[PDB]
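Summary for the steering committee. The consortium agreed at its last meeting that each partner would contribute one worked example illustrating the joint modelling workflow. Our contribution is presented below. We chose a case with several input lines so that the handling of multiple components could be demonstrated. No manual editing was applied between input and output; the record is shown as generated.
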Amino acid sequence: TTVNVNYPEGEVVGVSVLGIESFRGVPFAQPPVGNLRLKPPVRYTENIGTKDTTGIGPSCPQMYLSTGNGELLFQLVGNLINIPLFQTATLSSEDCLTLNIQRPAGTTSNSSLPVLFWIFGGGFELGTNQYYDGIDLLTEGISLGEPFIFVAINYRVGGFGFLGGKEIKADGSSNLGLLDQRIALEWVADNIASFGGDPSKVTIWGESAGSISVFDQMALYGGNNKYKGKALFRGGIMNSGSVVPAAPVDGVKAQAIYDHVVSEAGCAGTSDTLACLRTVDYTKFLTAVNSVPGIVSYSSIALSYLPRPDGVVLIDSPEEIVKNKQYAAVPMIIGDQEDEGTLFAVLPNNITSTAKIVQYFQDLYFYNATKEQLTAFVNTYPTDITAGSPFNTGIFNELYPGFKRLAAILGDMTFTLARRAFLQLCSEVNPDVPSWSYLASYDYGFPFLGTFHATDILQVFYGVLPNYASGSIQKYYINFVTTGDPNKGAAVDIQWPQWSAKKNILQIYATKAVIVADNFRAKSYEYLYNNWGIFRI
Amino acid sequence: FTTVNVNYPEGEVVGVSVLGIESFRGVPFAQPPVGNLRLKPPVRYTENIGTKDTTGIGPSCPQMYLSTGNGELLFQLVGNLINIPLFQTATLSSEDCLTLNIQRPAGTTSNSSLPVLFWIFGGGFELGTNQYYDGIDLLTEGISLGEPFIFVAINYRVGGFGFLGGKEIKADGSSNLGLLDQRIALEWVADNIASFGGDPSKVTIWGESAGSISVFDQMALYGGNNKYKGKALFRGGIMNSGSVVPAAPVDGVKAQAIYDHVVSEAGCAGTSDTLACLRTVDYTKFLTAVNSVPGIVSYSSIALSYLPRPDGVVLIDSPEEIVKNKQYAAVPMIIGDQEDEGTLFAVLPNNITSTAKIVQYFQDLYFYNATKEQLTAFVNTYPTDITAGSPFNTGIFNELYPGFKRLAAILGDMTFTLARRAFLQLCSEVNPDVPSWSYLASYDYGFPFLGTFHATDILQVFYGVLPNYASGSIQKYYINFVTTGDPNKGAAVDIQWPQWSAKKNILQIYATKAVIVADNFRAKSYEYLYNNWGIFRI
Ligand SMILES: CCCCCCCCC(=O)O[C@H](COC(=O)CCCCCC)COP(=O)(O)O
Ligand SMILES: CCCCCCCCC(=O)O[C@H](COC(=O)CCCCCC)COP(=O)(O)O
Ligand SMILES: *[C@@H]1O[C@H](CO)[C@@H](O)[C@H](O)[C@H]1NC(C)=O
Ligand SMILES: *[C@@H]1O[C@H](CO)[C@@H](O)[C@H](O)[C@H]1NC(C)=O
Ligand SMILES: *[C@@H]1O[C@H](CO)[C@@H](O)[C@H](O)[C@H]1NC(C)=O
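What follows is the complete predicted structure of the assembly.
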């Protein structure tokens, strides 16, 4: 029970169980090590012959926790996991540019199935394809309706993926994680066909950083998603991310991280700082990049690492890119969990007032907004305990005072009201490029967090628990990849309306779904839309 | 997948034989402590339980990983989330937890008469279960050595289910329930192990941490009476990291305070019989209430909310007094420590950076019967020099925050490493003819910040990872001891392990080697503590 495949780069061996044949950790690019560290990936020139992917793939270097920032226990854990035994135990190395392919069983060079290409989210600091297993997701596609190929990729995070500033910029070494994603895609154009894939029936799916990534791909190179004269993908599914306004890669925040990253790495004062870092051994290296503030901190979503406009790969701030019609527009489904904020609001329990909230954004989030506007945006948000997230929970779930408020805010600005804003602009500049959006509520009443960020990965992606939300979301996605419309393919219980028609979205409870106005929290949404620019993070 | 089964006096169980080991997981040893039996001493089954499938994974007793009412906000949030029924179900955790696991070599019969190793898990009296202590590696080692045995790992109640104190608990006769679970389980073994191929007259009890402390408490129980039906329950003890823990009584100020708090959280305050309200509270609410108090993963650290406390019957007196008065069942024993016991415990309380601060911290949370003068004197036996502290012999390294190494050392010594020496000394005085062997584990030397830290023995010794000198020698020493009553008899050993009392020497075990050394390090600390053991009642 093993297989088999031969392709232009090489040939591969996979193991099939219960109707799915999976190849894990197939190489897609040169291992970005030695001098290739901190530089764009390169597709393999010379055929790599035969490798076993019977195994478990690697992960690129993780940043679960800061080695230099945060509370002391977290720093301690961050340093420890960084040691060689731990990385080895978990298979994490600079040698990460590999990918996973999972198929129905028996599929062949003529099978010509559509492609589902996943991008994991870890807030650009972590994540890997290791635990996203395609199986009953692919199983449902087979279980009825439409079979497909599943692709899960690995890409550089933290320092490896998204180091910033001056020096990186000159080298054209910006936004490597993005490039990794792009090169993976190109590999799909060339090689996926040997696997019985249909090229350019390719739909890209992402969550969190993955979702933000999907939009970034459409945006890449001023929106040209054309490889060898053919479109790289035909559709996009984004869960809980899309447009993110960021200051330029040349920017104060990015130059500073880079400056302390070096200082920690002892390449400082060297003539060529950048050149030097590729000098440094991996363990010392990981430790320096992870020195920065991390997601699991007070810093929260003011990420040390994210994509930043550089003007080639990422020519402009993403909101502007939409406005200027400089992205590849393709059919899309975009979603948010009802309570995206809550997880993010937990750590900064400092922030007990708008005046407090304001200073917080001003210290760390937006250097471009005056105290005047921010105070206005936040004020769009009530202090009322009832008004917060988890939404519709009354006086309950108030972890500390203002938590629900902050959660609503962090959740909105970044994701939920970020999404409609994308939708409105997308409707304006590319009307006639269809789109659908939804709200997840299947986890209502879960204490404190409600239907929180990344709840989907379980409920939808692994389909736990099995129920109305699972079958329904899946059917829609499965249909979408197969047909390019959520509603077409399989028979669907509720016809999911285009967002632009009546500005409606689907709201899915565990056992029910319904159609509602995507109009909530309008004044907050409105201030943001009118003012999206000052929120460049 | 081969099944195998055993008829025994209380029932029949079906187990599983894999790769030369037969395992029965989830064998009940006592009536479920639910309903009227929550917060009551364990009771043996009065009726045959029938035939049980033990082929699966067994349950755990309710856990207190993190506090629901104390500590950092994130921890509180997680502490509450763990308690929802969906997660409880997922981890097989409930009040119906009095079960044990049995593992034996394939082909064992009621005829076999093997030695029994009885394992008690440690979780600081707040957590832990037998679920993740599988004997296959240890057993595989014994079989390979020619000294096969039967492995028994128990569940016992922890936290508020097991160790709730206060006067009402005392009056009910319900103190130290978790110790009673362990004891009743020993009694089950005495009755029933022969059916499984085990010899009830050759039981060795072993534990780590709270389990270790628990081994001494078993020797201590009922004034040293370890006889059931006229025979000794165990013949030897192995203690890894912990032994004698001086404590204030079950109806003391700390204990009463914890109980009053739990009662208030549970909605039982002002009832005519509060301990009786507690039995009627819904499980989720009760769990939330017991876990309400300060947890081990907090600033309070090893000043535990739940622990064994003297009640006058089950535990007659504070444990140091018990040894002194020759009131424990003195059996051959092995006792040991990881070189750096306190490092893990000193991570959270990182505002404790000075002599004055350490003293304040102890006076506030730890020792209510010690003066500032006495504490300051004990603390001052520890240098402030970075080199002096723990992790030991690491020089200028590993100083997590200033004073961390000193605090780790103090925490390590009073609770563990120095207490062990004091115990050894007392026993030799009152029981000179009962042999003891001790050692210090250093196999993880150089590990950053923590060194050879608390519970490192679970990996190196219980699971034998990584395979090396340390694992082979210790396991072999332990296995011989289970088989013969001496760590040196049985399989041939590289280094003869001396009895402690001869020259007060111990084994220090490195990853690749072992050496004999004097148990006299940090003598001034030891001596103060030994001379003053009573003040440190927690
Ligand atoms: C080991 C836990 C994995 C199962 C979680 C079930 C989630 C999906 C399920 O369909 O929704 C829920 C499960 O419980 C939810 O309240 C949230 C729990 C998930 C968060 C876990 C961090 C289904 O519950 P129900 O409405 O009662 O059918
Ligand atoms: C998943 C890691 C499993 C290894 C456990 C190691 C047990 C002891 C080991 O044999 O020797 C230790 C392993 O590393 C230790 O320093 C500490 C690791 C344990 C910390 C776990 C949080 C060193 O052995 P060696 O390299 O042979 O000298
Ligand atoms: C919150 O604590 C942080 C820790 O970095 C510190 O910056 C600040 O004092 C607090 N922030 C606010 C807004 O109070
Ligand atoms: C303190 O010592 C007294 C004797 O003076 C004793 O009765 C009491 O129980 C002790 N208290 C604690 C907390 O050890
Ligand atoms: C340590 O900090 C805690 C807050 O977590 C505080 O309650 C306590 O008083 C402090 N102790 C010392 C000795 O500073």
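Residues 56 and 398 of chain B are 43 Å apart (CA to CA). Residues 1-538 of chain B form a domain with the Rossmann fold fold (CATH 3.40.50.1820).
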